[PDB]
Each structure stands twice: as C-alpha cells, then as structure tokens.
Amino acid sequence: LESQYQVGPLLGSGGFGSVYSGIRVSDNLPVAIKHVEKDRISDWGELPNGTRVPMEVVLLKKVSSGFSGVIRLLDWFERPDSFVLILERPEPVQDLFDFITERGALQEELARSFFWQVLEAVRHCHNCGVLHRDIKDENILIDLNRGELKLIDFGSGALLKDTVYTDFDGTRVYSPPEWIRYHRYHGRSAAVWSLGILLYDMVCGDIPFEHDEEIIRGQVFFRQRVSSECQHLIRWCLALRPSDRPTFEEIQNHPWMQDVLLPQETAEIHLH
Ligand SMILES: CN1CCCN(C(=O)c2cccc(-c3ccc(/C=C4/C(=O)Nc5ccc(Cl)cc54)o3)c2)CC1
Ligand SMILES: [Cl-]
C-alpha cells in the first residue's frame, strides 16, 4: 500500500495532475507524490514485465539514472482510477517560473549557469532515447542549496525518433512555427526553439511571443538590456527555418556560453 509515505500539502496541480509533498516513512526521504487520472492520460506504453503504464513512467525509467539534472522516479503505484508516482523532492526547492516572477529578469551570469544545466539535462534525455517536448520555466526546479536545476514533468513527452512528429500537447507559446503552420516538427530542432524561448524568458523576465502571428513572424524585440552575444544566441535558436537552428553542440560552444559557473558557485553568489 501507499501507507509507506506520509503525505503533506498540495504543491500544485494542473495538466500534469496533482502533486503533493511527502516523506518516505522508511527513512524520512522527502518526496513528491504525483497523481494522474487514467481518463486524463495522453499516451500509454510498454514495460518489460509486460505491464501497461502511462508513457510518463516509461520515459522516466529510461532517464532515471542518478544524473541529478533530471528528476528521479523512485516508485509508482496503480490504483483503480489513477497512477501515483513517487518522485525525488529537493529541499528547499523553487520552480523557475516562480524564481523569475519574484526576481524579474535574471542577470546574464546566472541565466548562463542555469541555461547550461538545462542543456546538459536535455542532452541526457536525448541520449536515453527520450524527448521532453515541454521545456519551459515551470518544468524546471531549482535545488536552492546546491544550485542544481532538474527537469520535471515528462507527461507530454515521447520516445525520441528521427522522423517527423505530427502530434503535440505541450505549451503553445513555447512551440515552434512549423508546429503552428504545418502541425509537423522534428524533435531536436523543436527542442532548440523552445530553449530559445526559455533563454529569452530568463534574461527578459517574460516570454517573447504571446500570439500565433508573432511566433510565425519570428521577429524578436528585447525589452531589457541584453548583451549582443546573448541576443545572437537567442535569435539563432529562434530561427524560423528548423535546419538553421543550432545543434546542442553549437549552442554549448557559443561565445555567450563560455566560462559557466559551477552549480555550487551559482548557489553561493546568486541564491544563498
Ligand atoms: C506560487 N507558490 C509559492 C512558491 C512556493 N512554491 C514553489 O515554487 C514550488 C516548490 C516545489 C515544487 C513546486 C511544484 C508545483 C507543481 C509541481 C509539479 C511537479 C511535477 O509535475 N513533478 C514534480 C516532481 C518533484 C516536485 Cl518537488 C514537483 C513536481 O511542483 C512548486 C509553490 C508555488
Ligand atoms: Cl498546441
């Protein structure tokens, strides 16, 4: 039974389900307990055992080594109307959207540290065969003591493949023009677009495009002082033609990305 976790308060709820704070009774491990209604589940999937499960579980197991840039699935249960996942919970922790709301635009140095960590994490998912598809500030947690970001919510994700996707259920205003115009995208180039949006969100304090037409026109106006190198990087990720977008390798070799702080230094200077 799930009588082996003590449940605390609701942390948040939405398209990902309802997520509660918890503590594993076994060892007082802090956890997050996520509930997902079977009626509301997008894709389903295939475990070795043979058992049928939400794609989210498959995706999380494919990725849940101990690399700390992606949230670790500790356990899961099936209930009559629902699945419950036990996830690791850092503490103290704060979600990036909150951090930006409280802080406004982030200094470049801290945006760089954070953006590099997000890139390492997304490369991790891709090497484990998983496409997140909903990269944005709300799906990123900051472990405030260690200065470590973790990607969460794989509920809109998919197995990574090299052919075209024609379905999408993440967030529209993070989605690339080719989704909006043709309902087709490739995994990596769409991911790069959404990383451009994310990076703009960090340095300007808000997303650049509210509407379909703005996404499709792809003109980027900066409302804050942002350095030329960072503007270049963002505009490159936000190229209209997918194949003009940089690879992960070209983004991590970009001049704006050099000399990144280690996560612990980041915590010491900007979060402690
Ligand atoms: C505005 N209000 C006040 C600030 C304090 N505060 C936070 O920033 C805060 C701190 C920790 C978590 C969350 C939060 C909300 C929604 C979720 C969703 C999760 C999910 O889908 N998978 C997960 C795995 C691990 C964890 Cl820890 C959370 C999730 O997580 C939010 C509440 C917001
Ligand atoms: Cl959409």
Q: Give the number of whichever ligand sits closest to the CA of residue 94.
A: 1
18 is in an annotated binding site: yes
Instruction: Tell me the C-alpha distance between 130 and 153, whole Å.
Output: 12
> Does residue 54 have a cis peptide bond before it, meaning omega lies within 30 degrees of 0?
no
Q: Is residue 153 within 6 Å of ligand 1 at its C-beta?
A: yes
CATH classification at residue 102 = 1.10.510.10
Q: Do 101 and 62 reside in the same domain of the chain?
A: no
Q: What is the number of structural domains in the chain?
A: 2
Q: Do 122 and 81 reside in the same domain of the chain?
A: no
Q: Do 192 and 66 reside in the same domain of the chain?
A: no
Q: Do 84 and 115 reside in the same domain of the chain?
A: no
Residue 118, Cβ density class (10 Å: 0-12 exposed, 13-18 middle, ≥19 buried): buried
Q: What DSSP element (H or E) covers 143? A: strand 140-143
Q: Of the residues 72, 91, 110, which one is the last residue of a structural domain?
A: 91
Q: Find how far residue 201's CA is from the centre of its chain.
A: 13
11 is in an annotated binding site: yes
Q: Is residue 15 within 6 Å of ligand 1 at its C-beta?
A: no
Structure tokens given for 205 = 């304090």
Q: Give the number of whichever ligand sits closest to the CA of residue 141.
A: 1
Coil, strand or helix: which one is 24? Answer: strand
Instruction: Tell me the C-alpha distance between 7 and 245, whole Å.
Output: 44
Coil, strand or helix: which one is 169? Answer: coil
Q: Do 62 and 50 reside in the same domain of the chain?
A: yes
Ramachandran category for residue 50: left, alpha or beta (phi over 0 → left; psi -120 to 50 → alpha): left
Residues 97 and 138 sit within 8 Å (Cβ to Cβ): yes
Q: Is residue 16 within 6 Å of ligand 1 at its C-beta?
A: yes
Q: Do 187 and 62 reside in the same domain of the chain?
A: no
Q: Do 183 and 214 reside in the same domain of the chain?
A: yes
15 is in an annotated binding site: yes
**Shortest-distance Cα residue to atom 7 of ligand 1:** 94
Resolution in Å, one decimal place: 2.4
Count of alpha carbons within 13 Å of 218, Cβ hemisphere only? 20
Q: Do 229 and 162 reside in the same domain of the chain?
A: yes
> Solving technique for this entry?
X-ray
Instruction: Tell me the C-alpha distance between 117 and 263, whole Å.
Output: 8
Domain that holds residue 55: 1-91
Instruction: Tell me the C-alpha distance between 213 and 235, whole Å.
Output: 17
